[PDB]
Ligand binder design. Structure first.
Ligand SMILES: Nc1ncnc2c1ncn2[C@@H]1O[C@H](COP(=O)(O)OP(=O)(O)OP(=O)(O)O)[C@@H](O)[C@H]1O
Ligand SMILES: Nc1ncnc2c1ncn2[C@@H]1O[C@H](COP(=O)(O)OP(=O)(O)OP(=O)(O)O)[C@@H](O)[C@H]1O
Ligand SMILES: CC(=O)CCCCn1c(=O)c2c(ncn2C)n(C)c1=O
Ligand SMILES: [Ca+2]
Lengths: 694, 146, 49, 48
C-alpha cells in the first residue's frame, strides 16, 4: 500500500498521455505475471466470501457445527464453477483444516478481507487513474478486466472529483468514501435537506455565492450527521444514562409524536362534536356530552392528558434535535463575521440589527463556540485584528485571559474538579444560556410548539381550546402547506387590496350619507324607523357588512329608487359599486391566488430544468456533455458529483494533515482560507483534454 | 355490464351508462383530466374548508347560539346550534352555499353587545370560505389547463 | 410480484410473449450460484426432460 | 403579463451585457467572467 501511494504521488499532476503514466504502464507490463497473481489473489478471496454467503454452499454444508469437509468444499466450488482446480487446491491449502479435514469457512473467508482492503482500494485507484489518463492503451485493458471484481467491489467507496489545481489545469482526484459516510448521506433527512438547498440556491442563489452556500450546506449536514449518530440507538450515572436514552428516543421519534398529537386532536374534536347545551342539568346554561355509552367522557380526559404530554415531549424533542443546528449556524456566522468581516472590531452592527445586538453578549462568554467546531476562533480573531485594534481590547471583548493563553501552550495542566451539583451550578454560563434562549424563542418552530403546548393547557381548562390544534394539519401535510403558500405568496397585495376596498366603500358611504339617507330604512313598521346612514359610522358598517356580501351590492339591500329625482344617480351608484367591488376587487383576489399557483409551479419547473440542463458545479450545459453518449449523466455521477465533493470534505477532515497529498493539502488550505477557486467553473477534464481524449 | 343488468331490474339504472361519454370523447376526457390533475389538492382544500367551518361552528356554539333560531313562530323555536353536530351541519350546508356566508342565513346582530364580534365572524367566514377557498379551486382548475 | 410468483412453475408461463426459452436461459445464468434443482423447482422445470 | 415582464427584464440582465449584447455563457467560460465583465470591463455606470 505504501509503495502504491508512492506511485500515486509520482502520478500527481499527470497529464493525459503523460510520460510518467506511460512509464508506469510499461513497468506493469514488464511485471504482468505478478500483477496478475496479486489481482487473482484479491478476486479469489472476494469470490470466496460471496460464495460462502451463497445458499448453494450451505446446501453442501451438512454439519451442525458449521464446518465443512475438504471434499465437500471442493464439490461446492466446482459446482459454482467460478474457480479452476488449481485455485481450489490453493484455497484448500490456505484453509486451516483440522485432522478431520473440516473447515470453518466463515473465518477462512473473513481472514483476508480487512488486511487486503487498503491495498485493494489503492490498486483500484491506481488502475483507474492510469486508465483515464491513458485512454487508449490495449495493455491496460487486460489488467482492468482482471481487476473487474476489485473495481466492482470498491466502486461505491471510490470517490472522484475534479478541481482547478495550482498547475492551472483541471485535475482529477481519487479518494476513499466510508460506508458510514455514504449511509449517513443516504439517510432520508439529508436527502430532503439537499432538495431544499438545491431549490433555494437555484431560485434565489447567485453563481458567485453558490460555492459558499454549498460548503455551508455540507458543514451543516456534517453537524446533522453527528447529531443523528449521537441519538442513534445501539445512581447519578444511571439517572443520566436513562435520561440520555429518553431524550434520544424523543429525538428519533419526534415526527411520530407530532403525528400522534394530530391524531389525538382529531379524536378529541370528534368527541367534542357530541357536546350539547341545556338549561337543565343532565339562569345559566350547562354544557355536557350526549352519549349513551358513558365511556367517551373519561376518554376525553385521558386524551387531553396524553395530548398535553405529547406536546411537552415534542417540545423537548425539538430542543434536543433541531436547536443544535440553529445554534451551530448562529455561532458559525458570528465567527466568520468576526474573523473576516471584523464586525464588532471595526464595523459594529447597524443598530437596526437585533440579531447583532443580541449576539454581542455571547462573545465574552467562555462557552461561545459550544456547538460550532472552531474553538480557536477567538485566538485567530485576536491574531488577525489585535495589532490594529489593541490586543487587550480584543481580549476584553472576547473574554480572553492573555496570561492564561501562553501558559496553556507552555505546559499541560489538569485541574479536574470532583463532580458535584454545586460545581455544575457554578459551571453553568448564565449569559450564554440567555443568548441561547433568546435565539430559541425567536425561532419560529419552537414558538409554534410552545403555542401548541399552551393551547393544550388551556384545553384542560375549557376543552374547546383543543380545536386550535387541528390547524397543525397545514404543517403536517405538504399539500396543504403548498396550497396555503399560494395564498401567502401575495398576502401583502391581498391586504392592500382589502384596504382599497375599504376606501372605496368609505367613499360610497360618504355619498350615501350626504345624498341617499332616505333609502336606507330597514324597518318594516313605519312607526319605528331603522335608518343605517343617519350616522357615518353606522353607514360604513352597513356598507362593508351587507353590500360586499351581497351579489348585487348595496342596491340589493336598500330601498328601490323608482319614481325618485335621484334615481339615475343611484343606479350609477349601485352599478359602480357592483362592478368596482363585487367584480373587480374580488377578481383581483382570485387572480393573485392563480398567479401564486403559476409562480410556484414555474419555480419548481425551472429548478428541474436547470438541474437536468446544467452541472450544479461546472455551470456547463448538458449539450456539450451529451456530445458524448450519456455524457451529462456520467459527468454528474462520476466526474462532478456534489455528494463526492461533500465526501471529500469529510475525508479531508478525518485524515491527518501529514498524510495529505499535494492536492489534498492545496484544497484543505483553500478550505481554511475560504477560497473556492479549486471548484471547477466553466472547465472540465473532458474540455481540457478534448484533443487528446478523442 | 352489471349496471345494464340492474337496469333490467329497474330501468333508471341505465342512466349511469351516459357517463361513458367521457371515455368515448377525447374532449370531455381532457376537460375532466383538468379536474383530475389536481384532485388530491382539491380534496385537501375541502378538508381545510371543513376544519375552518368546524372552528366557526365552535365559536358560534360557545358565543352565538341565540342568533341561530330559524323558526318564525316564537312558541316553537328551531335552534341549530344548541347541538354541535347540528351547528356544524347547518354551517357546512347553508353558509357555504350562501354568497354572503352564514350571516346571510342567521339573525341580524344589530343592537347587541356581541355585534362587532359577529360582524368579524361573518366577514371572515365570507372571505376565507366563499372567496379564497373557492378561488383555490378555480385556480387549481385553471393551472391544470395551463 | 407476489401475484406473479404463481405463473413461474406453470408450463404456460410464456404463452403470449415470444421467448419460450426464458426458463432455460435463466437457469443457465443463475444455476451455478443458486442451485440448478432449486431453479428447476421454482420454474417447474424437468431437468431430465 | 406584468410578472413575465419583470421576469424577462431580470433574465435578460443576468444573461447578457447591457452594452455588449454578448451572453453570460461566453464570459462564464472564464470563472465569474460575466460578473467581472459587468463590474469592470463594461460597466454602464463607468460609461456615464
Ligand atoms: N453536479 C451535479 N451533481 C449531481 N447531480 C447533478 C449535478 N448537476 C445536475 N444534477 C442532477 O441532479 C440529479 C440528482 O438526482 P436526485 O438526487 O434528485 O435523485 P432522486 O430522484 O432523489 O433519487 P436517487 O438519488 O435516490 O437516485 C441528477 O438527475 C442530475 O441530473
Ligand atoms: N453592462 C452592465 N453593466 C452593469 N450591470 C450589468 C450589465 N449587464 C448586465 N448587468 C447586470 O446588472 C446588475 C446590476 O445590479 P444592480 O444595480 O441591479 O444591483 P442592486 O441590487 O440594485 O444593488 P447594488 O448596485 O447596490 O449592489 C448586475 O447584476 C449585472 O448582472
Ligand atoms: C471548510 C469550511 O469552510 C467549512 C467548515 C466545516 C468543515 N469542518 C472543518 O473544517 C473542521 C471540523 N473540525 C475541524 N476542522 C478543521 N469540522 C467538524 C468541520 O465540519
Ligand atoms: Ca507526509
Amino acid at each position: 500500500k505504501d509503495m502504491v501511494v508512492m506511485l500515486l504521488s509520482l502520478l500527481e499532476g499527470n497529464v493525459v498521455n503523460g510520460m510518467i503514466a506511460r512509464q508506469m504502464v510499461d513497468m506493469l507490463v514488464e511485471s504482468s505475471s505478478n500483477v496478475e497473481m496479486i489481482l487473482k489473489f484479491f478476486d479469489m478471496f472476494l469470490k470466496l466470501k460471496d460464495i460462502v454467503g451463497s445458499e448453494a454452499f450451505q446446501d453442501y454444508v451438512t454439519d451442525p457445527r458449521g464446518l465443512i469437509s475438504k471434499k465437500d468444499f471442493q464439490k461446492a466450488m466446482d459446482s459454482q464453477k467460478q474457480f479452476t482446480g488449481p485455485e481450489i487446491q490453493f484455497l484448500l491449502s490456505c484453509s486451516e483444516a483440522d485432522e478431520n479435514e473440516m473447515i470453518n469457512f466463515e473465518e477462512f473467508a473473513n481472514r483476508f478481507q480487512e488486511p487486503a482492503r487498503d491495498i485493494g482500494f489503492n490498486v483500484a485507484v491506481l488502475l483507474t487513474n492510469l486508465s483515464e489518463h491513458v485512454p487508449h492503451d490495449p495493455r491496460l485493458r487486460n489488467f482492468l478486466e482482471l481487476a473487474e471484481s476489485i473495481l466492482e467491489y470498491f466502486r461505491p467507496y471510490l470517490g472522484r472529483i475534479e478541481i482547478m489545481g495550482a498547475s492551472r489545469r483541471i485535475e482529477r482526484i481519487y479518494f476513499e468514501i466510508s460506508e458510514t459516510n455514504r449511509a449517513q448521506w443516504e439517510m432520508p433527512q439529508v436527502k430532503e435537506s439537499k432538495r431544499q438547498f438545491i431549490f433555494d440556491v437555484v431560485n434565489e442563489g447567485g453563481e458567485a455565492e453558490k460555492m459558499e452556500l454549498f460548503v455551508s450546506f455540507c458543514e451543516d449536514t456534517i453537524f446533522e450527521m453527528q447529531i443523528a449518530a449521537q441519538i442513534s440507538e445501539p445512581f447519578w450515572g444511571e439517572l443520566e444514562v436513562q435520561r440520555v436514552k429518553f431524550l434520544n428516543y424523543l429525538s428519533r421519534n419526534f415526527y411520530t409524536l407530532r403525528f400522534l398529537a394530530l391524531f389525538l386532536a382529531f379524536a378529541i374534536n370528534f368527541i367534542l362534536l357530541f357536546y350539547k347545551v341545556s338549561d337543565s342539568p343532565p339562569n345559566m346554561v350547562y354544557y355536557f356530552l350526549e352519549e349513551s355509552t358513558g365511556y367517551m367522557e373519561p376518554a376525553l380526559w385521558c386524551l387531553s392528558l396524553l395530548h398535553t404530554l405529547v406536546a411537552f415531549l415534542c417540545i423537548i424533542g425539538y430542543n434536543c434535535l433541531k436547536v443544535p443546528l440553529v445554534i451551530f449556524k448562529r455561532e458559525k456566522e458570528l465567527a466568520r463575521k468576526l474573523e473576516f468581516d471584523g464586525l464588532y472590531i471595526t464595523e459594529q452592527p447597524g443598530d437596526d440589527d437585533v440579531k447583532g445586538q443580541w449576539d454581542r453578549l455571547v462573545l465574552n462568554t467562555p462557552s461561545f463556540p459550544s456547538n460550532y467546531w472552531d474553538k480557536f476562533v477567538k485566538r485567530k480573531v485576536l491574531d488577525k485584528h489585535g495589532d490594529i485594534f489593541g490586543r487587550e481590547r480584543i481580549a476584553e471583548l472576547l473574554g480572553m485571559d492573555l496570561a492564561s493563553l501562553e501558559i496553556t501552550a507552555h505546559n499541560e495542566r489538569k485541574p479536574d474538579p470532583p463532580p458535584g451539583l454545586l460545581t455544575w451550578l457554578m459551571s453553568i454560563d448564565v449569559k450564554y444560556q440567555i443568548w441561547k434562549f433568546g435565539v430559541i424563542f425567536t425561532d419560529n418552530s419552537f414558538l409554534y410548539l410552545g403555542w401548541y403546548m399552551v393551547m393544550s393547557l388551556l384545553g384542560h381548562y375549557n376543552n374547546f381550546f383543543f380545536a386550535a390544534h387541528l390547524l397543525d394539519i397545514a404543517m403536517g401535510v405538504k399539500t396543504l402547506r403548498t396550497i396555503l403558500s399560494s395564498v401567502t405568496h401575495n398576502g401583502k397585495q391581498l391586504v392592500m387590496t382589502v384596504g382599497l376596498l375599504a376606501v372605496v366603500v368609505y367613499l360610497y358611504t360618504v355619498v350615501a350619507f350626504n345624498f341617499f339617507r332616505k333609502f336606507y330604512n330597514k324597518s318594516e313598521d313605519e312607526d319605528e324607523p331603522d335608518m343605517k346612514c343617519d350616522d357615518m359610522m353606522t353607514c360604513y358598517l352597513f356598507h362593508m357588512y351587507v353590500g360586499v356580501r351581497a351579489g348585487g351590492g348595496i342596491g340589493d339591500e336598500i330601498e328601490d329608487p323608482a319614481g325618485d329625482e335621484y334615481e339615475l344617480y343611484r343606479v350609477v351608484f349601485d352599478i359602480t359599486f357592483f362592478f368596482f367591488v363585487i367584480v373587480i376587487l374580488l377578481a383581483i383576489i382570485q387572480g393573485l391566488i392563480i398567479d401564486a399557483f403559476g409562480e410556484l409551479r414555474d419555480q419548481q419547473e425551472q429548478v428541474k430544468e436547470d438541474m437536468e440542463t446544467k452541472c450544479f458545479i461546472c455551470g456547463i450545459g448538458s449539450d456539450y456533455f451529451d456530445t458524448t453518449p450519456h455524457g451529462f449523466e456520467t459527468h454528474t455521477l462520476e466526474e462532478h458529483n456534489l455528494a463526492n465533493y461533500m465526501f471529500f470534505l469529510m475525508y479531508l477532515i478525518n485524515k491527518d494533515e501529514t498524510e495529505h497529498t499535494g492536492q489534498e493539502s492545496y484544497v484543505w488550505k483553500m478550505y481554511q482560507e475560504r477560497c473556492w477557486d479549486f471548484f471547477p467553473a466553466g472547465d472540465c477534464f473532458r474540455k481540457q483534454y478534448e484533443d487528446q481524449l478523442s
